[PDB]
């Protein structure tokens, strides 16, 4: 979805 960097899962 989001184009941003995903953080800790």
């Amino acid at each position, epitope marked *: 979805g*989001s184009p941003g960097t995903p953080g*800790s899962r």
Partner: antibody
Amino acid sequence: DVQLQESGPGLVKPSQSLSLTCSVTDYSITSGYYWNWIRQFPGNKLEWMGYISYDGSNNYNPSLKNRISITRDPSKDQFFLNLNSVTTEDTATYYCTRGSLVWGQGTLVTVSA
Amino acid sequence: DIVMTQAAPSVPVTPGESVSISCRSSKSLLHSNGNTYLYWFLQRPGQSPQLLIHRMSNLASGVPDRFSGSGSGTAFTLRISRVEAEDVGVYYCMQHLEYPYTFGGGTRLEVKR
């Protein structure tokens, strides 16, 4: 705190393969984030090369054609840049990053005979 | 690819005054989620790039609130109020909407003395 450090040869011959390693400390590369390679040419232009994600999936810059692979070893918290068939156009300072926020110190690679 | 353009290669500023650095994109950076994916970086001499602003207007950590990001669609501004001598370096925009991520050419901030 999370830190990243590039390592590898600083001199590569034309037409050969460039390989660099990013060693990540104090964070598991499988836990999250995108893990990028970005390079800076002489003259200071920046180019995003690609990333490997927390699941080992990739995305690369089409500018690099089919020359680039980014791979990882979760057991060592390392990820790797491989760039085939280099020319003098690949002379640059190579940075590994965690997303846009955390940067390595960069490592210079010169392509020359 | 999305083309990023920074019209001014450099900008002079008197300390204590404000400056605006411009960036333009070839396509709107607005995502359906309502965020606009434009990031700003500063690179000081002999250092790695530092994130200043993410998602057009959000201030990254370790940056004085003298720094702000604004804009919309294809036109963006990094504004620095109350410029200090230590602000010297090169400011780069980067779009983070589509792959490949792409950078503007940079604008060097020069302090007048």
